[PDB]
Design a protein around this ligand. Structure first.
Ligand SMILES: [Mg+2]
Ligand SMILES: [Mg+2]
Ligand SMILES: [Mg+2]
Ligand SMILES: [Mg+2]
Ligand SMILES: [Mg+2]
Ligand SMILES: [Mg+2]
Ligand SMILES: [Mg+2]
Ligand SMILES: [Mg+2]
Ligand SMILES: [Mg+2]
Ligand SMILES: [Mg+2]
Ligand SMILES: [Mg+2]
Ligand SMILES: [Mg+2]
Ligand SMILES: [Mg+2]
Ligand SMILES: [Mg+2]
Ligand SMILES: [Mg+2]
Ligand SMILES: [Mg+2]
Ligand SMILES: [Mg+2]
Ligand SMILES: [Mg+2]
Ligand SMILES: [Mg+2]
Ligand SMILES: [Mg+2]
Ligand SMILES: [Mg+2]
Ligand SMILES: [Mg+2]
Ligand SMILES: [Mg+2]
Ligand SMILES: [Mg+2]
Ligand SMILES: [Mg+2]
Ligand SMILES: [Mg+2]
Ligand SMILES: [Mg+2]
Ligand SMILES: [Mg+2]
Ligand SMILES: [Mg+2]
Ligand SMILES: [Mg+2]
Ligand SMILES: [Mg+2]
Ligand SMILES: [Mg+2]
Ligand SMILES: [Mg+2]
Ligand SMILES: [Mg+2]
Ligand SMILES: [Mg+2]
Ligand SMILES: [Mg+2]
Ligand SMILES: [Mg+2]
Ligand SMILES: [Mg+2]
Ligand SMILES: [Mg+2]
Ligand SMILES: [Mg+2]
Ligand SMILES: [Mg+2]
Ligand SMILES: [Mg+2]
Ligand SMILES: [Mg+2]
Ligand SMILES: [Mg+2]
Ligand SMILES: [Mg+2]
Ligand SMILES: [Mg+2]
Ligand SMILES: [Mg+2]
Ligand SMILES: [Mg+2]
Ligand SMILES: [Mg+2]
Ligand SMILES: [Mg+2]
Ligand SMILES: [Mg+2]
Ligand SMILES: [Mg+2]
Ligand SMILES: [Mg+2]
Ligand SMILES: [Mg+2]
Ligand SMILES: [Mg+2]
Ligand SMILES: [Mg+2]
Ligand SMILES: [Mg+2]
Ligand SMILES: [Mg+2]
Ligand SMILES: [Mg+2]
Ligand SMILES: [Mg+2]
Ligand SMILES: [Mg+2]
Ligand SMILES: [Mg+2]
Ligand SMILES: [Mg+2]
Ligand SMILES: [Mg+2]
Ligand SMILES: [Mg+2]
Ligand SMILES: [Mg+2]
Ligand SMILES: [Mg+2]
Ligand SMILES: [Mg+2]
Ligand SMILES: [Mg+2]
Ligand SMILES: [Mg+2]
Ligand SMILES: [Mg+2]
Ligand SMILES: [Mg+2]
Ligand SMILES: [Mg+2]
Ligand SMILES: [Mg+2]
Ligand SMILES: [Mg+2]
Ligand SMILES: [Mg+2]
Lengths: 101, 88, 271, 114, 70
RNA sequence: GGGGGCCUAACCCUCGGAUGGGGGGACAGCGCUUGGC
RNA sequence: GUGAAAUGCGCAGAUACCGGGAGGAACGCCGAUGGCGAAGGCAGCCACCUGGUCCACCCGUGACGCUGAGGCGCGAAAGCGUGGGGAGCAAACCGGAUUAGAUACCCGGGUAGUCCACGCCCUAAACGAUGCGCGCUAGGUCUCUGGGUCUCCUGGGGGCCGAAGCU
């Protein structure tokens, strides 16, 4: 088991109802891969530096989890399958290295 | 990689006495595990050559040690080599 | 991958035969509603209409499920991968939980004990078939229908496959094994994955005899004939084409399109 | 196509000839010119003076349709680089802005023998 | 002349999310600013760039903003 | 009258009988007539 | 497009501009006198599997070491085999120009190849032109990386100047 920071970015122009629907798939899949969650953050829509999928905006997420390091790749595969998912990105969790402290 | 626990299953099992973490018996066992790990890895990553050098080095290191143990005492050898099952 | 032979005889030094590793310890075919009679080297008048045929080994016909939509949602275990003398691909005898049994063209990766199924519901797990309009754009796929409800007809040869290029209305773009870009309908079913036994293209018949077992008679050159028989005839000593290369029936045969012009099927293609 | 006040000007300047093209806010061209259009042929086409004249001509032809405001966009390195721009100053068009959008790869395609 | 580091307090330079922090290292072109302008350490500059790039992928940072007035 | 697009019901293909469903579609096929290879 | 040209492309609408789509290959800024590797060599980002290396604690085995003919393994680019892939570039090849000539330097075209899978090939200015290991013999300065309460001490790398000495 290892700690990760699963980012996800979704289509902003979708309704808030289907937004919940895609969020549902995120959860089930998460569980199917034993991705027991933790401190989650959902910063909503934000300003994109470049049009991702012809769309100037995008809905953001961000998690933190423990799960078998083996099925972490398989997971990212399962996430991207949705059309309204624009940018999955798992990352190794890392203690805050800081400067100017 | 090998789990911190997985190492103890070995160390605790091969030490001649509590707190022993350096006896030839142990080092050999400790290599043997690490060796077979790499072995099984290269068994799928045929292209990974650099790592294969590691294996040669590690196999060599083990090879020397067994000379030494078989040298100063054939008893622990015929036994240890048998437990880990090698030379064939 | 491919079995070779030591040259203990000529024409045995070169011939390679396929390995049947995938063939799941199953010699006999599914005798059930599966095998069937078969025959015949020329048309319904007595006349030959396809030169150089016949003499092949005897063969039973394995019935293949090409529609696979008459059992929507009903899952099935992949009981076996069998040999099939009627196609380049290997087939998969699957036992439906329904209790029914059927043959499907066994794709690459598929192996016994898969929970394969077909329906709009189905996952994008390989072996599963579902209407094109549901398969994610990009997925390689095989055994595709051309029009809805008319069974598979595309990509069925060993190791063949077509890819989904995108959508547009009720149609989906495919790139056929040929390389053709085409708008196929959305409701047209297509089983996910690529066709099994891709090593096929690499066998080497080796001897003239091996071609005979495949029902292929020897094939004689136009040049080896007389003007009476063939355009290239008149072989007054190994002679060059009288110009320009032509069929036994007199039509040119080196670059000379034969597809019909005002075919309706036309506007659904892209070269 | 139609008559418009606001617009944009593209400056293509290579070491071998400079060329400008005026376009409406959408991007769709209205008029253009270059060292050849002016009359120069061959090596002269790369001249800053040539580039000047072409800029004025393209501007001149543009003001005819109704052009007045124009965001300037440059792509190149040619001698008529800023020169084409200096000519858009005195053009008679309101130089609303100036930007370098010269394309440049993040290292991908192998270049010619140079 | 304006060491980017001294222009802001304590910050986790591994965080690939705080735009206003990282953005102050990207210049008027998107070019990841040199260590001759950020003044950071060897290691600092590195783990920095990595986290910058991480951001540019989520769309939190530009790859190249066109050169403005000149 | 020409050109572009859509439609369905002729006409064609197909679907565990269908008086119907799906696909193509005023095209294609076929009739008479025109010139050509 | 060049020194200037011409071949070339363009009214069958090219170059220049915008939008939409397919595809291959390589990774700008960071980036450097930088890092890693036994060498060949290695660069966007992400995760998985894995080799080596360094510092600290002074806990463990107790000379178990060094070198190494043969043997085995790796080994840039080009090249070869079967089958993929082929955007850019590009030997050969074609044309333009140059020249006394110009199978070349320059220009317009252009195919293997460059990319992927697997199998061979085994060469090089494979250069530090410096075989490996261990101890010994002033220092000054720049840089990389680690430990210690830290204008300095202590390890391991990457440079420059230079004691003695060698040449
Ligand atoms: Mg070694
Ligand atoms: Mg003794
Ligand atoms: Mg052995
Ligand atoms: Mg042995
Ligand atoms: Mg034996
Ligand atoms: Mg054995
Ligand atoms: Mg034996
Ligand atoms: Mg029967
Ligand atoms: Mg028949
Ligand atoms: Mg069953
Ligand atoms: Mg013949
Ligand atoms: Mg004859
Ligand atoms: Mg006859
Ligand atoms: Mg003839
Ligand atoms: Mg004849
Ligand atoms: Mg003759
Ligand atoms: Mg003849
Ligand atoms: Mg021919
Ligand atoms: Mg014909
Ligand atoms: Mg001149
Ligand atoms: Mg009228
Ligand atoms: Mg009228
Ligand atoms: Mg209708
Ligand atoms: Mg209809
Ligand atoms: Mg009917
Ligand atoms: Mg209808
Ligand atoms: Mg209809
Ligand atoms: Mg008609
Ligand atoms: Mg007719
Ligand atoms: Mg005719
Ligand atoms: Mg003719
Ligand atoms: Mg035309
Ligand atoms: Mg046009
Ligand atoms: Mg261009
Ligand atoms: Mg475009
Ligand atoms: Mg589109
Ligand atoms: Mg292509
Ligand atoms: Mg692409
Ligand atoms: Mg270097
Ligand atoms: Mg090294
Ligand atoms: Mg070198
Ligand atoms: Mg490299
Ligand atoms: Mg890499
Ligand atoms: Mg480099
Ligand atoms: Mg210390
Ligand atoms: Mg002790
Ligand atoms: Mg001791
Ligand atoms: Mg000891
Ligand atoms: Mg002792
Ligand atoms: Mg040797
Ligand atoms: Mg090569
Ligand atoms: Mg080819
Ligand atoms: Mg090839
Ligand atoms: Mg070229
Ligand atoms: Mg050339
Ligand atoms: Mg040629
Ligand atoms: Mg001559
Ligand atoms: Mg020549
Ligand atoms: Mg010549
Ligand atoms: Mg010659
Ligand atoms: Mg030449
Ligand atoms: Mg010369
Ligand atoms: Mg080519
Ligand atoms: Mg050759
Ligand atoms: Mg090639
Ligand atoms: Mg390549
Ligand atoms: Mg590839
Ligand atoms: Mg060999
Ligand atoms: Mg080599
Ligand atoms: Mg060198
Ligand atoms: Mg040395
Ligand atoms: Mg230390
Ligand atoms: Mg101080
Ligand atoms: Mg020290
Ligand atoms: Mg270093
Ligand atoms: Mg040092």
């Amino acid at each position: 088991m290892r700690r990760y920071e699963v980012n996800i970015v979704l289509n902003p122009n979708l309704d808030q109802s289907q937004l919940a629907l895609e969020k549902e798939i995120i959860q089930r899949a998460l569980e199917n891969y034993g991705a027991r969650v933790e401190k989650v953050e959902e910063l909503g829509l934000r300003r994109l530096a470049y049009p991702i999928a012809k769309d100037p905006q995008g809905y953001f997420l961000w998690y933190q989890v423990e799960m078998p390091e083996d099925r972490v790749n398989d997971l990212a595969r399962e996430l991207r399958i949705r059309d309204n998912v624009r940018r999955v990105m798992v990352v190794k969790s890392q203690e805050p290295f800081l400067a100017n402290a | 990689p090998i789990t911190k626990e997985e190492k103890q299953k070995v160390i605790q099992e091969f030490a001649r006495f509590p707190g022993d973490t350096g006896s030839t018996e142990v080092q050999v066992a400790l290599l043997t595990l690490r060796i077979n790990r790499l072995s099984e890895h290269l068994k799928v990553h045929k292209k990974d050559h650099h790592s294969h050098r590691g294996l040669l080095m590690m196999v060599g290191q083990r090879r020397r040690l067994l000379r030494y143990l078989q040298r100063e005492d054939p008893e622990r050898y015929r036994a240890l080599i048998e437990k880990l099952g090698i030379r064939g | 991958a491919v079995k070779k032979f030591k040259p203990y005889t000529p024409s045995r030094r070169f011939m390679t035969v396929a390995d049947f590793s995938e063939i799941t310890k199953t010699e006999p075919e599914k005798s059930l509603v599966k095998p069937l009679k078969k025959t015949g080297g020329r048309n319904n008048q007595g006349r030959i209409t396809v030169r150089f045929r016949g003499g092949g080994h005897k063969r039973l016909y394995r019935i293949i499920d090409f529609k696979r939509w008459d059992k929507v949602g009903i899952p099935a275990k992949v009981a076996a991968i069998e040999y099939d003398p009627n196609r380049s691909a290997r087939i998969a005898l699957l036992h439906y939980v329904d209790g029914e049994k059927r043959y499907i063209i066994a794709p690459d990766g598929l192996q016994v004990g898969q929970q394969v199924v077909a329906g709009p519901d189905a996952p994008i797990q390989v072996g599963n078939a579902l209407p094109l309009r549901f398969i994610p754009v990009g997925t390689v796929v095989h055994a595709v229908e051309l029009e809805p409800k008319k069974g598979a007809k595309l990509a069925r040869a060993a190791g063949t496959s077509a890819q989904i290029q995108g959508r547009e209305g009720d149609y989906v773009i495919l790139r056929l094994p040929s390389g053709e870009l085409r708008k196929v309908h959305g409701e047209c079913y297509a089983t996910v994955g690529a066709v099994g036994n891709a090593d096929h293209k690499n066998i080497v018949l080796g001897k003239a005899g091996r071609s005979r077992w495949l029902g292929r008679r020897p094939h004689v050159r136009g040049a080896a004939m007389n003007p009476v028989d063939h355009p290239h005839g008149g072989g007054e000593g190994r002679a060059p084409r009288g110009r320009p290369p032509a069929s036994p029936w007199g039509w040119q045969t080196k670059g000379l399109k034969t597809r019909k012009r005002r075919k309706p099927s036309s506007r659904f293609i892209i070269a | 196509k139609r008559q418009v006040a606001s617009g944009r000007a593209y400056i293509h300047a290579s070491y071998n000839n400079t060329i400008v093209t005026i376009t409406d806010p959408d991007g769709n061209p209205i008029t253009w010119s270059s060292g050849g259009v002016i009359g120069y042929k061959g090596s002269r086409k790369g001249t800053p003076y040539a580039a000047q004249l072409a800029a004025l001509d393209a501007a001149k032809k543009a003001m005819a349709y109704g052009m007045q405001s124009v965001d300037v966009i440059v792509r190149g390195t040619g001698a008529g680089r800023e020169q084409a721009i200096r000519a858009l100053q005195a053009s008679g068009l309101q130089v609303k802005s100036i930007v370098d959008d010269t394309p440049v790869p993040h290292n991908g395609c192998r270049p010619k023998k140079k | 002349k304006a060491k980017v580091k001294a222009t802001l307090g304590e910050f986790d330079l591994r965080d690939y999310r705080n735009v206003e922090v990282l953005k102050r290292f990207l210049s008027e072109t998107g070019k990841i600013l040199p260590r001759r302008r950020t003044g950071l350490s060897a290691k600092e500059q590195r783990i920095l760039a990595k986290t910058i790039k991480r951001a540019r992928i989520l769309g939190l940072l530009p790859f190249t903003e066109k050169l403005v007035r000149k």
